[PDB]
Enzyme design. Structure first.
Site, PDB file in Angstrom:
ATOM      1  N   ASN A 145       0.820  -1.197   0.000  1.00 46.47           N
ATOM      2  CA  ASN A 145       0.000   0.000   0.000  1.00 46.47           C
ATOM      3  C   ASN A 145       0.860   1.255   0.000  1.00 46.47           C
ATOM      4  OD1 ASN A 145      -1.987   1.887   0.204  1.00 46.47           O
ATOM      5  ND2 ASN A 145      -2.627   1.375   2.306  1.00 46.47           N
ATOM      6  N   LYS A 158       0.015   4.192  -0.263  1.00 41.09           N
ATOM      7  CA  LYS A 158      -0.762   5.295   0.312  1.00 41.09           C
ATOM      8  C   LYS A 158      -0.589   6.532  -0.581  1.00 41.09           C
ATOM      9  CE  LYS A 158      -0.545   3.348   4.950  1.00 41.09           C
ATOM     10  NZ  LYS A 158      -0.427   3.691   6.402  1.00 41.09           N
ATOM     11  N   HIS A 198      -9.915   0.450   4.562  1.00 40.66           N
ATOM     12  CA  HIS A 198      -8.661   0.823   5.177  1.00 40.66           C
ATOM     13  C   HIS A 198      -8.885   1.802   6.352  1.00 40.66           C
ATOM     14  CE1 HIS A 198      -4.580   2.340   5.743  1.00 40.66           C
ATOM     15  NE2 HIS A 198      -4.212   1.165   5.258  1.00 40.66           N
ATOM     16  N   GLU A 239      -7.426   4.361   7.494  1.00 43.74           N
ATOM     17  CA  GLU A 239      -7.428   5.782   7.128  1.00 43.74           C
ATOM     18  C   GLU A 239      -8.788   6.218   6.524  1.00 43.74           C
ATOM     19  OE1 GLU A 239      -3.686   5.558   4.964  1.00 43.74           O
ATOM     20  OE2 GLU A 239      -2.725   5.053   6.880  1.00 43.74           O
ATOM     21  N   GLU A 278      -5.738  -4.773  10.508  1.00 43.03           N
ATOM     22  CA  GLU A 278      -4.885  -3.656  10.912  1.00 43.03           C
ATOM     23  C   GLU A 278      -5.021  -3.384  12.406  1.00 43.03           C
ATOM     24  OE1 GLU A 278      -6.969  -0.913   7.781  1.00 43.03           O
ATOM     25  OE2 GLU A 278      -4.859  -0.352   7.805  1.00 43.03           O
ATOM     26  N   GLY A 282       1.145   4.654  15.817  1.00 34.02           N
ATOM     27  CA  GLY A 282       1.435   5.976  16.344  1.00 34.02           C
ATOM     28  C   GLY A 282       0.995   6.218  17.773  1.00 34.02           C
ATOM     29  N   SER A 336       2.668  -3.005  11.449  1.00 31.88           N
ATOM     30  CA  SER A 336       4.038  -2.674  11.077  1.00 31.88           C
ATOM     31  C   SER A 336       4.843  -3.947  10.798  1.00 31.88           C
ATOM     32  CB  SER A 336       4.692  -1.804  12.151  1.00 31.88           C
ATOM     33  OG  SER A 336       6.074  -2.110  12.294  1.00 31.88           O
TER      34      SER A 336
END
Lengths: 246, 247
Positions: free
Chosen positions: A9, A11, A93, A95, A163, A169, A209
């Site tokens: 991906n 992005k 996804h 996001e 995911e 983060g 990750s």
């Protein structure tokens, strides 16, 4: 045995120049027969990437809308994706869900429309940190999977991507064990809610990750069938991840 | 100045390479007047395709973009990618983005500033819904929307404002040429007293409501209407009639 699946991906990154160099790297890479490899370029470059990439690598859109044509300025349809030579679309996804507020129902409708149009779908799910710490990993992840499943008639063209949004983060990390526990549970939902055949044959890929260093222990997990790679997908180490099973 | 007449064709989410290739062939063969600036906004998967096939006289626009140059925004594109594809414009704040995809004024503002800082021109859309129009608040909605855009504009020479009478889509209403003029003139009056006189006189304010073969002429004649952002007609031969609306 489910065929190992590695998605990259990209992005919202790249221009023709550096993406052309990336692609040149991938074209020269030896992709094993047993591994299915897919790259998801930014929407402006689906057509470019498909022209430049060797046929052994498939192309995916990063998103689509739920109707074939219409008054939706800024959207693209599965028909257009197909027309550009891409054979996959990423849907749901984190996001899209969490920055752009895409609901489960919307994602479901998109899944049904992409599948009805002859595209394969990489359908993403995952829980946020506040959901994880509240103990509701299963609830969130099962509810997201259900709405997808409600909109799937033929699982042979679907790949589920987990995911661990709770690890992006936030200052928390997912271990290979924790990834495995979720994957196995997702497979167990496919068993208790859809069928045993579908639980057995459906690729559930890891969207957390993944590096050249950790991809191996992750790939060795019984219920992890591959990866949806974020940032490492833009780098030579994506080839190390293509080679993960050994 | 005077303000150069501006005709944008918004293809929205329509077309494939075949029928869009045929449309483009139609546009390439059309004689576009020197005094008219023409821009086409293809679906995002076809910005690159359309730019390659379209004659340089016609500019290419993206239908949307995000507010940062690169990043973790699966499904988005940046002004840098739009430029890299040879497109020189982006449509921002379109009613479909605002009202189907819930894009806020703040977001649209940030997108406008970033697109401009990247060297793209911006077609910035505003417009009130039916419930807003019948409530008497056309000015409030449309002035607030324009203010957030203007807050994020340092150079108006690369901006075009498009008024979409959303209150008149499918609902069943039709916007008269007078009604369009009344709004355009008010928008220009907002620019004059909140930005500058120079920006009021020089900024194209284009009409984004339903425009045909038949009705484009009276609309184009209006003192404060500087052109069109064409919806569905943009996919058809009659877009060429709209390119020629002045004469």
């Amino acid at each position: 045995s489910r065929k190992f699946f590695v998605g990259g991906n990209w992005k919202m990154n790249g221009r023709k120049k550096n993406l052309g160099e990336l692609i040149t790297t991938l074209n020269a890479a030896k992709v094993p027969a047993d591994t299915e490899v897919v790259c998801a370029p930014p929407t402006a470059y689906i057509d470019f990437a498909r022209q430049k990439l060797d046929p052994k690598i498939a192309v995916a859109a990063q998103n689509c809308y739920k109707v074939t044509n219409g008054a939706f300025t800024g959207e693209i349809s599965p028909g257009m994706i197909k027309d550009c030579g891409a054979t996959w679309v990423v849907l749901g996804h984190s996001e899209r869900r969490h920055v752009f507020g895409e609901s489960d129902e919307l994602i479901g409708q998109k899944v049904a429309h992409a599948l009805s149009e002859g595209l394969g779908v990489i359908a993403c799910i995952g829980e946020k940190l506040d959901e994880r710490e509240a103990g509701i990993t299963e609830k969130v992840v099962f509810e997201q999977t259900k709405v997808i499943a409600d909109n799937v008639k033929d699982w042979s063209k679907v790949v589920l991507a987990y995911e661990p949004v709770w690890a992006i983060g936030t200052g928390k990390t997912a271990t290979p064990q924790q990834a495995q526990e979720v994957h196995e549970k997702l497979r167990g939902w496919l068993k208790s809610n859809v069928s045993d055949a579908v639980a057995q044959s459906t690729r559930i890929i890891y969207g957390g990750s993944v590096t050249g260093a950790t991809c191996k222990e992750l790939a060795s997990q019984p219920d992890v069938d591959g990866f949806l790679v974020g940032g490492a997908s833009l780098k030579p180490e994506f080839v190390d991840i293509i080679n993960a099973k050994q």
